[PDB]
């Protein structure tokens, strides 16, 4: 016969000063199916943003991955979002599948953009989506490095330079017009160093891995380049810190997690500070300058997993905004104000690890749930933040004042 | 080319834990150096001699222990918190023979205080109790370190439950709080995944995503505590799959040197750590096979 | 559910027999307000001309004075107690005006701006009330009705409260560890200042609401800008939890006190330079500085002692600090001791007390008397040397809360002990010899004045309880409900009141003589 049915939400605001911060789903992106993508534990889904020169005024395009599949559309901010039963271009990778990408902001243009797709084995692709044309599979043979590329970034100011990263704990330098060996290329040492080592490419003709670059031990989880091009910072699961100068290839600075390994890292928008997510459920505040830990931020009930500086809200007296997303399904927004960042004005080692006694600890201005999988992407915006969690529903919030335009 | 074990019924629970106990570098020597520790030092003999059947230790333990003997399945935590304290009570006898800290305490042991406040007197009582297990309650995407300050979350005795404090000599508002006051040399960290959900008049497998790192130090310390920064690395975890208490399959991980490996039944396979992260939990949770860890053990540095 | 309480003291008490709480100070007549965890607020006189500084006490409240203000230019003060309730005082004439009955828990802080003479009300029961003095004035048996207002946001009990002088921040503090802030005038909650690890016990706010001074059980003090909505600056100056802060007229220097015993004098725009000005006796609860003066000539200092210190800050200017300022007080106040122990004796009769001095005592629970001090003379031998064999049950409960014997006879037990008249110390001609039940014959002499027990009699015959005994019916966890002194049960309003408040179980023993 019959039987009998016997028998926790997201949030959709936050406030902060400034005033309501509003979720709106009629901007949101998705598969256009909209059923939720399997969180498998497999890859993140990613986001990457670029404008075409605001050739019509509906210049910005978006671009995620799903797995198996890489979409492509016009992204319309906090307006309805662009119809998204039609793509500008879609993408499925039968075999391994794609991991993270970025494009290239420079040569980008109503007619061709430039973006790289990295994989889970290793590969890093080139396409243009709007004309769908070209392509070139870099390290398409697997004999650079056959772990799982984690970070691929355009290198800044450049056209034709680029950066990846692999689970190896390695990185290496391409050029897209260089073509890759028909084997295992070779390399001689460049900079040997405590806990780091690059090695520069052994050829008589011009092959891509211009050069590896040797992080620590475990996987290189993310690098990202000075707001200025001319540093690089390389968070790696051995919980190392590990700031470069990228021109000079040395070693500016490091900093090591209370304990855990450390899974995202940021500038902030004047290149002054750096924010590390990790492990330990933290996130830290480091100084530029000074070399030196400035703060911790416990909030998040599980790891980090992006961390970034929100260029719009910021700045007599100094202040930055920063938010984090984790695994916890939260977005945490942060406030450095002059107390904490200097503290001292009128009105293994432990020592580059301080202890968390002699360290302050920051509480988040907001810390709410805003999805059911754990996140995967934080991007501030001119009218709005933008989130991500793995089953791939690409959120975008509305800034206070944001939502609607009168002339 | 490798070792393991032998899968009688539901012998897993002890298969896995056993494993485990095996990779704890400070466990495996005192415990062939020199009852129920005679079939234990007979197999940890037997494997560094060298897939053996553990024959001596199940109807062995199936005899001295009624509550195992039953061919259903087998809480692992239930059997790890057993052998471990059946060996040292054992310990205290032949100490007897020729209330004193014995060398299984010397490694697994750790206390922690009970901590009450009159929030007025602001003055404060300490209960210690000591421990093997931790036994640390779980919720949905979330991590072990964020698990291990719930343990220690604020318990409020306030209003018509006040507290009467000596010292104020009335009834105040109080705190009560559980912190780790001196670290194990092996913190074992039991996760409750199986929980007596009364609804049905049942118990529940909870297949939530509890993430854990390889590398810890704990937040929780008493603030007396004496040795407050260990910084832990994980030797072993016992994952375990199923979807209920007593339909369960243990399985073991572990560390020696820089490999990593996994013990299924009988069957080992060399995998790496970028591995660990398929026994963290669900998040979708279709209550499905939720492979998944259990009990962790983390080991000292220093 | 309502009990019977019963206090055995001295008529007056003029000393706090417990420690102070909370001062005020009104200085056009130079008088101090204490306020005791003894129930009773006393006002004394600030004058070092005169010997006796005692003036008089205000009586009403059941448990601690947790706070109070003083306001409208001394005529008004209001008060806050551990009783629950919230009380507004004629302190010129030192009497209680009404009762407000609002809170459900300790109510453990009051806040004061002059301006608008408005206080606000908080507590345990983590709600904040809003006070317009005038009305509260205003209060007849006719008019008597207040309309309340309240402010919503504390999620924990609130332990410490501050309004600005001109009556638009307010400010709580709590065991949420966050400071709260509200505009009182349209209640909007304006801003939180998360900062601080621990409870909050004490704050201030400069005159234009501008910036904060708070003091923590973390051990810190902070200054905080409502304009920037942040923490500007944090001072670590003691090794434990921070519960009280006074400052100067110009919010330039602050005065910090609490369970560290050291108090300093601390420079907000140079902390290097702080001046141990005391390490006082017990933990420091609540200070008042002297305003009268700027460098302000003396600072007023509660503990939980019993005796009220005044220390006088001359020195300030040329004077980790290890070295005091002050060795000894200016003034003193003098403290009573508080009763810290209690044993019932066998016969269910008498106590048997040790006090703060080791002053052990004898007490004839009964008739409600001391009998004979016994010096300090050990406590668990006198137990010894005074027994006797026999069993009698329980019949009432003690309490050393006020550190006064307070008594308490609850429906339940109180009549559970029947005690023959000759061995309970009651002769006869006749050698009658009942057998009396202590509690009833207890209830009839404590109403022994009261009319509707009053034909050829008035009380139990056997023994009269002193006629200023206060007798207090209260409620099981609950409000007191009223209260009097046992000679004053045959007024007229009072007698009205007995009929409408003592519980059924009572009358039948003091009107009909059922049991």
């Known amino acids: 016969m019959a039987t009998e049915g016997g028998g926790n939400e997201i949030k959709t605001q936050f406030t902060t000063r400034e005033g309501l911060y509003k979720l709106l789903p009629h901007s949101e992106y998705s598969r256009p199916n909209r059923v939720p993508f399997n969180s498998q534990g497999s890859n993140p889904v990613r986001v990457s943003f670029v404008n075409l020169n605001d050739q019509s005024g509906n210049g910005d395009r978006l671009c995620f991955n ?33 991991t993270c990408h970025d494009f290239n902001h420079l040569t980008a243009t109503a007619e061709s953009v430039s973006l790289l797709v990295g994989f889970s084995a290793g590969q890093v692709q080139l396409i243009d989506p709007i004309k769908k044309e070209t ?103 051995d919980g190392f810190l590990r700031v470069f100068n990228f021109d000079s290839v040395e070693l500016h600075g490091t900093m090591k997690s209370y304990f855990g390994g450390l899974l995202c890292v940021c500038w902030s928008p004047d290149g002054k500070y750096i924010v590390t997510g990790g492990e330990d459920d933290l996130v830290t505040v480091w100084s530029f300058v000074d070399c030196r830990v400035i703060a911790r931020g416990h909030g998040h009930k599980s790891w980090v997993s992006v961390v970034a500086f929100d260029p719009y809200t910021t700045s007599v007296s100094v202040t930055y905004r920063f938010g984090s997303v984790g695994q916890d399904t939260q977005l945490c927004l942060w406030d450095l104000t002059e107390d904490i960042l200097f503290p001292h004005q009128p009105l293994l080692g432990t020592p580059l690890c301080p202890r968390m006694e002699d360290v302050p600890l920051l509480e988040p201005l907001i810390c709410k749930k805003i999805a059911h999988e754990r996140l995967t992407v934080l991007i501030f915006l001119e009218d709005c933040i933008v989130t991500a969690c793995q089953e791939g529903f690409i959120c975008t919030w509305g800034r206070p004042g944001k939502v609607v335009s009168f002339n | ?259 990593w490996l996994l013990f299924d039944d009988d069957i080992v396979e060399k995998i790496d750590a970028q591995a660990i992260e398929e026994f963290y939990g669900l998040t979708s949770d279709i209550s499905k096979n939720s492979e998944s860890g259990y009990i962790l053990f983390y080991q000292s540095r220093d | 559910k309502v009990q019977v309480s019963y206090v055995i003291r001295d008529e007056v008490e003029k000393y706090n027999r417990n ?62 107690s551990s009783d629950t309730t919230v009380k507004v005082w004629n ?60 402010l919503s946001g504390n999620k924990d009990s609130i332990y410490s409260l501050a309004m600005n002088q001109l009556g638009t921040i307010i400010v709580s503090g709590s065991t949420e560890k966050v400071l709260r802030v509200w505009d009182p005038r349209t209640c909007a909650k304006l801003m939180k200042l998360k900062g601080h690890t621990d409870n909050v016990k004490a704050l201030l706010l400069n005159r234009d609401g501008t910036q904060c001074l708070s003091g923590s059980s973390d051990g810190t003090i902070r200054l905080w800008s409502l304009g920037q909505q942040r923490c500007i600056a944090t001072y670590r100056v003691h090794d434990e939890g921070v519960w009280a802060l006074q400052v100067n007229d110009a919010f330039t220097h602050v005065y910090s006190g609490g369970r560290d015993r050291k108090i300093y004098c601390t420079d907000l725009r140079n902390p290097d330079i702080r001046v141990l000005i005391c390490e006082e006796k017990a933990p420091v609860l609540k200070m008042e500085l002297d305003r009268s003066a700027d460098p302000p000539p003396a600072i007023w200092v509660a503990t939980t002692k019993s005796t009220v210190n005044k220390w006088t800050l001359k020195g300030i200017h040329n004077f980790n600090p290890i070295t005091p300022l002050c060795t000894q007080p200016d003034q003193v106040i003098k403290g009573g001791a508080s009763i810290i122990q209690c044993h019932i004796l066998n016969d269910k009769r008498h106590i048997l007390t040790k006090d703060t001095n080791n002053n052990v005592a004898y007490w004839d629970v009964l008739k409600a008397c001391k009998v004979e001090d016994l010096g300090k003379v050990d406590f668990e031998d006198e137990i010894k040397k005074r027994f006797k064999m026999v069993y009698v049950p329980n019949w009432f409960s003690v309490d050393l809360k006020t550190g006064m014997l307070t008594i308490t006879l609850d429906e339940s037990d109180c009549f559970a002990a029947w005690v023959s008249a000759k061995d309970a110390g009651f002769s006869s001609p006749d050698g009658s010899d009942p057998k009396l039940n202590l509690g009833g014959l207890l209830l009839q002499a404590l109403l022994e004045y009261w009319p509707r027990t009053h034909e050829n009699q008035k009380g139990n015959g056997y023994f ?52």
């Open chain 1, 66 to 98: 799903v797995g198996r599949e890489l979409y492509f559309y016009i992204y319309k901010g906090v307006r309805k979002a662009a119809d998204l039963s039609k793509p500008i271009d879609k993408r499925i990778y039968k075999g391994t599948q794609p």
């Open chain 1, 135 to 237: 392509s070139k599979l870099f390290n398409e043979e697997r004999l650079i490095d056959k772990s799982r590329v984690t970070c691929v970034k355009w290198v800044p100011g450049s056209e034709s330079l680029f950066l990846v990263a692999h689970s190896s704990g390695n990185m290496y330098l391409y050029n897209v017009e260089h073509t890759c060996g028909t084997t295992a290329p070779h390399y001689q040492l460049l900079k040997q160093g405590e806990s780091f080592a690059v090695h520069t490419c052994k050829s008589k003709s011009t092959r891509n891995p211009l050069l590896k670059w040797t992080v620590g031990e475990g996987a290189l989880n993310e690098f990202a380049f000075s707001p200025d091009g001319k540093f690089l910072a390389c968070v790696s699961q």
């Open chain 2, 1 to 259: 080319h490798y070792f393991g074990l032998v899968n009688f019924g539901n012998t897993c629970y002890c298969n896995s834990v056993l494993q485990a106990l095996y990779f704890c570098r400070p466990f495996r020597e005192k415990v062939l150096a020199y009852s129920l520790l005679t079939c234990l030092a007979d197999l940890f003999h037997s494997i560094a001699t060298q897939v053996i059947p553990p024959k001596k230790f199940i109807t062995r333990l199936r005899k001295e222990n009624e509550l195992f003997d039953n061919y259903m399945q087998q809480d692992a935590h239930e059997f790890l918190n057993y052998l471990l304290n059946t060996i040292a009570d054992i310990l205290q006898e032949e100490r007897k023979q020729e209330p004193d800290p014995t060398w299984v305490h010397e490694i697994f042991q750790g206390t922690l205080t009970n901590e009450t406040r009159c929030l007025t007197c602001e003055t404060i009582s300490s209960k210690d109790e000591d421990f093997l297990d931790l036994s640390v309650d779980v919720e949905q995407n979330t991590s072990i370190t964020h698990c291990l300050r719930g343990f220690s979350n604020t318990e409020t005795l306030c209003s018509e439950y006040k507290y009467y404090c000596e010292e104020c000599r009335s009834k105040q508002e109080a705190h009560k709080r559980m912190k780790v006051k001196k670290l194990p040399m092996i913190l074992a960290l039991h996760l409750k995944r199986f929980k007596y959900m009364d609804q049905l008049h049942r118990y529940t497998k909870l297949s939530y995503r509890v993430v854990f790192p390889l590398e810890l130090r704990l937040f929780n310390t008493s603030g007396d505590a004496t040795n407050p920064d260990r910084m832990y690395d994980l030797v072993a975890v016992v994952v375990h799959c199923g979807s209920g208490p007593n339909r369960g399959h243990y399985i073991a991980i572990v560390k020696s040197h820089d490999f």
């Open chain 3, 19 to 80: 420690g102070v709480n909370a001062l005020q100070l009104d200085p056009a007549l130079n008088r101090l307000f204490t306020a005791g965890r003894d129930s009773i607020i006393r006002i004394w006189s600030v004058n070092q001309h005169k010997q006796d500084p005692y003036i008089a006490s205000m009586e009403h409240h059941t448990d601690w004075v947790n706070d109070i203000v003083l306001c409208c230019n001394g005529k008004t003060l209001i008060s806050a």
């Open chain 3, 91 to 150: 302190a010129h004439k030192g009497f209680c005006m009404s009762t407000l009955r609002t809170h459900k828990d300790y109510v453990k802080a009051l806040a004061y701006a002059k301006d608008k003479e408005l206080v606000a009300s908080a507590g345990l029961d983590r709600q904040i009330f809003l006070w317009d003095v005038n009305t509260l004035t205003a209060l007849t048996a006719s008019n008597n009705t207040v309309t309340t207002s309240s």
């Open chain 3, 464 to 515: 009269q309880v002193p006629p200023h005994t206060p007798v207090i019916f209260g409620e099981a966890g609950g409000r007191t409900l009223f209260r009097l002194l046992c000679r004053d049960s045959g007024g007229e309003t009072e007698s009205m009141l007995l009929n409408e408040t003592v519980p059924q179980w009572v009358i039948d023993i003091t009107v009909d003589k059922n049991m």
